[model samples]
Target: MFHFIPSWYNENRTWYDNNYLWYFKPTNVGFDDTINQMKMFDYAGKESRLVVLNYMPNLRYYLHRYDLLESGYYSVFDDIQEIGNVRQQMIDFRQLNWPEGVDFTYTPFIVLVKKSGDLIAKVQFGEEGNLTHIDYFANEQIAKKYLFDDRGFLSSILYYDNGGEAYQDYLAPSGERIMREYLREGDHHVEINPKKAIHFLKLSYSDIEELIREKYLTYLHKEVSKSDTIIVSFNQVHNAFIVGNTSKGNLILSVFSERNNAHNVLEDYSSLSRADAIICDRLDIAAQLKEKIDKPVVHVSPFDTRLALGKSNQVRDLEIYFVVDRLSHKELQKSLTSLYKVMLKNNDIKVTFVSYEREFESRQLTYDYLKEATKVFDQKFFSLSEKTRLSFTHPLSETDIINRLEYVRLIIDISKIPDLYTQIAGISSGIPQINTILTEFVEHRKNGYIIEEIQELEKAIPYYCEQLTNWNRSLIYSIDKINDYTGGQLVERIINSY
Candidate 1:
């Protein structure tokens, strides 16, 4: 049996795709771990489950949105809510209990008003067009706010003081206030009973976190068997909890990204000391951790993909995608300047910048800045036809990237660490990638080019873009490289590691 523990924290959390559904506030679902677990479960077969340790009232909607409803999973909130049968029922926005004499006007935002055009409240809706939360106005200031679950239940409420959240009440499906969190005071109180409204004394912030950790430990003790292998991937706090709580199961520490420094590794020594085994998605990280920590370390590819080699096309344009989400402004400028020269040398080559940045402010700056860069470059060095070859997009979905990969000639990513998804998709599509650093996925010269500096793109670009023979050679190498890391083979390798 296998159990995966993903990251849990609300602050600064963002979803990968926002078109389906999303919340204005922080959500516990770590997009990275969710994607990792989805790929792992695709290969891990039926003996695995995702153990979510957080207060996610909209777990059902989250599972459905991510299309993970069919997978085996356990949620602490589910046990606490006592939700036996999850039936999704949405309440009409018009039917919401509102203050008398308030009129409604739907103008992007659900604006509530009086006949004399006085403001009442503004309703915020999720991306899925369901009511997420509403803010009540008093003297043109927000007095209180009500939050709703995706399943159409009032889940939380907060009182405001001069636009600052003063107190928050977490509610159950039965309309009972289960927990009251003081925002300004940094303490919490628990309600023991709905019938009698029993209350507990104020608990410090650490105490509330401690309480949740205990709740999670209790759940793990009940669900995890002696023979099971528990893989803790996401939260560092949960990593310690799993290592400290589980005595029977083989605790596996799964590191999905590269550790920052020696200090970071030293910081993780507490959890690493008790881990029965350690697994990393990158070979370099695995090698580093294995040397310092006396535990079995193995590199496991998180992506489960089959080879989908690019087909021959008659189009003369050589389209390259530069994943710029992780690149710094300086790096982006250097990369763009280098690629611009590459285009100058090869007239048929075209470049497109793609980033999956979630923040609107950053995304807007990236797009507008890139656009101006292209404009400046074009004014200095290109014809009307040549200017049309350069383009950029701030974001694109995974499926969109895959679909676009069908026509792509090469993938260019020179961030300190190239995007993992880009490398995986490049290999799967049999498209060669150019990177500044070495990764397990990219084999320096055979499958993709690894350069030490941005200037080297001039030499590497023609090899894959202008020359058909060289491109085909790299294509065949990528196809060969991906076959060994297919879902079934990688799963077998992971199972053997333990």
Candidate 2:
């Protein structure tokens, strides 16, 4: 976009001002989505400087951030002289009764309208930003002030209707909604009529920011051209912090683009002591990087990664999550073993694995692929039966996952989620899968703590149950100071109704 494009100053270039355009949309569901959508821009694209995700996101739409900040919190405090001074600087205030009565210790506001039909009662100055009189507006005709928070959420408002009916509402931010409220008529009172909602809605804010940037671009788009290419793109796990650099005089921009619950927590395996290494996105990249750098290369999306090779300094389970698409199923014999040899040493642990996806409603059935993979696995090494290694459940529908979460008790997620958020069963799954459970004891085989823990869990045919207790209490506080009598109560009720 004209505003989101790559931009910087040039030293060797001969260019006048207004030589380029740029664009950017920050509220995109994801960064990549922003880029893909950008390719569709024809001035009739998904983005609209006029569109926003709120019925009324803020009180003042066109004011600078600092201007509004100087206005101060509506509930927190502000007075006439404070409102008057700020208003004067922003607008040339006319004293309708300038000579009739110099009763001018009040907020002086001017009606400023937008080209798009929006309006603002710009302030001159906060008149030194002091608390004037925290009541209704003192108007010769009419005056209004809107107060809002950083993300454009409503905080509170103050306005004097020409009809003599003044209204103010105090609200609190609760998650995504402005749930808590207090309605007042002169100083404090009840309801804001349904039609009155339009009053609040009319006072809106925007990317504003984005709208402001468009103004800057309009100024710059007013010249000529250069070899300066503006590549607009957004990406992963995001800005990736390195800024996704480009060569001299070039630009690279990126965005984060997946949606739904398909996002990554990314920081991983901290609680997993045994996970000294990492699985990889591509084995070729891994092997190649192994030449210059010994560490595994990280990927933005783990997606279908396989193979975990720990750093050379540490020896941990060489794990791999079976990736169906990467397994050469069409030519079953030409698969891994055809090229794969038994390279792992006897002391190293090895096993074929799947996520037991039946655990979730969205299960992945790598059936045909698994048949090929398993054939190779079974032939190439020791193995587990279809039953013991399986999630041991028949096909499950997407709706039946338990509402209550429980620890599976004896296993570690091969993904190595943090230990504090535990669901591991007694023993670890990394033990070498040998010929048979009935085989004679091998000199190198002996489970110490893991065996004891696993044996304890295997006997849990019937476990005890108990009721809640032991947690203590404290109800000495009032909810009002933090919020009101019903702080987040309204937000909670709306959630329950859904």
Q: What TM-score would each prediction reach against the true structure? A: 0.78, 0.22
Error of 2 at 377 (Å): 6.1
Off by over 4 Å in 1: 12-34, 58-67, 91-95, 98-131, 194-206, 258-270, 304-317, 324-348, 355-369, 376-387, 396-406, 415-429, 452-455, 472-485
Show pairs that collide, candidate 1: none
Q: How accurate is candidate 2 locally (lDDT)?
A: 0.25
Could you say which candidate leads in TM-score? Answer: 1
TM-score for candidate 2: 0.22
Tens-digit lDDT string for candidate 1 (1-498): 888776644543221012223322222223354445456556556477777766665555556545576777786655554444556778776776667767888674455654357667777765456776778878788888877777777777888896377776766777776656555554443433344332222233343455566567776778888888887763554555677666777877777663224346546777788777776777777778877888887666654253247753556788888788777777777877778788778878877778766666887888877766666674543322214676666433454566667788889988886666677777667788998887778777777898888889888988888877878887788666555554456556656665
For model 1, what is the alpha-carbon lDDT of residue 74? 83
| lDDT tens digits, residue span 341-385, model 2 | 332222232333333333233323445444445554654343224
Model 2 misplaced regions, further than 4 Å: 1-312, 326-328, 331-333, 338-340, 344-364, 367-498
TM accuracy, model 1:
0.78
Candidate 1 weakest ten by summed lDDT = 12-21
